């Protein structure tokens, strides 16, 4: 009956942005006061929906997208935005209806001497379509000569490491991001009363 929002927000480890996880929430009662009454979030941008009224709505499904990015890249998680994260890792539709929630996670995700486990896609010949996940690790062919799956000249690994460190500036520090997508057919997800 209780929607597993805690498993998403309070997760011990988040996924890399290139392989962002999506949680399907269905057939449960969702309490959102835990979210919008909180004081832990640095960003709670909502587009087209009112979070303070979320306890009086019925949807077909709710999606929870989780990943970790830098502080400077949080601005890219918004409709009609461009950048390495927005174009190659996680893209929001221009008609996006939902909330983008982010909070600083330097305590949990930045290690002394760096983390090197959170990754992002650096090379891609075309921008991602909205809500598309690309987990390919094929060597990026920057020239005409084939790469044969070995790094070299005009042959780059598509993924790069964030390397979060505690001593970095606020923009460089890791930020856990949860993107709430509301889909509205029978209504399986509703708030209290």
């Amino acid at each position: 009956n209780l929607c597993p929002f805690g498993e998403v927000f309070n997760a011990t480890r988040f996924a890399s942005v290139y392989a962002w996880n999506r949680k399907r929430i269905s057939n449960c009662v969702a309490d959102y006061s835990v979210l919008y009454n909180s004081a832990s979030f640095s960003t709670f941008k909502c587009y087209g929906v009112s979070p303070t009224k979320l306890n009086d709505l019925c949807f077909t499904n709710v999606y929870a997208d989780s990943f970790v990015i830098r502080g400077d890249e949080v601005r890219q998680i918004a409709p009609g935005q461009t950048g390495k994260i927005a174009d190659y890792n996680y893209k929001l539709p221009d008609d996006f209806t939902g909330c983008v929630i982010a909070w600083n996670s330097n305590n949990l995700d930045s290690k002394v001497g760096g983390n090197y486990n959170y990754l992002y896609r650096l090379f891609r010949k075309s921008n991602l379509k909205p809500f598309e996940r690309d987990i390919s690790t094929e060597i990026y062919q920057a020239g005409s000569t084939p790469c044969n799956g070995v790094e070299g000249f005009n042959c780059y690994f598509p993924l790069q490491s964030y390397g979060f460190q505690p001593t970095n500036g606020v923009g460089y520090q890791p930020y856990r991001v949860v993107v709430l997508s509301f889909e509205l057919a029978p209504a399986t997800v509703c708030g209290p009363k």
Partner: antibody
Amino acid sequence: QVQLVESGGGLIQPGGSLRLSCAASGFTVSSNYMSWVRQAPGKGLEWVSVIYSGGSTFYADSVKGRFTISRDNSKSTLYLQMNSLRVEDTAVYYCARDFGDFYFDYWGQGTLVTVSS
Amino acid sequence: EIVLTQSPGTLSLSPGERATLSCRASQSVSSYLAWYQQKPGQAPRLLIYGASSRATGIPDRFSGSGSGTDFTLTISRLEPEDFAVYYCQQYGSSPRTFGQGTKLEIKR
């Protein structure tokens, strides 16, 4: 081998328009980040614009709204349109191959743009 | 905007010595620095990417060091083919910025 040859530099009155061409060899233009970097006489290097492998374009504050960066895959050339030029825009504009919006591993010989009445 | 300051502004050492060039930044960039060498009438050439990684085709005598706000370029075995202007560029935060340069002069 990698080659970057530039063209289009010259004299232009303030408020005029000028386009800079940069033919590229040794790599695929469409699949790489590429940037224009200008160097005013005795001032040093300054980043101007970048075009991503996916086609996204970003510009500097001093040139935003006036400069337009573009690529022609059919002709393997990187372009830089310079509308509403100013006297302070006078610099030597370099054509550089960008490694993922981080650093410029290959540079063109550079072309000189002089803006004066 | 982040400002990179190179010290010294100019430097003149005899061939065969060690040239030490500093490069300090406004904020910490976490080793996201690059070193370039520009000979007169020529384009800049990439020497070192990252704080310490050496670009292809550059001799081992060129070495990068430092992290955060302090970086160092050390050129050992100074040969007359050297002695150009050296810039350092950061790429930790947009927009990318360069240093004012450090002219390298030969002494005779």
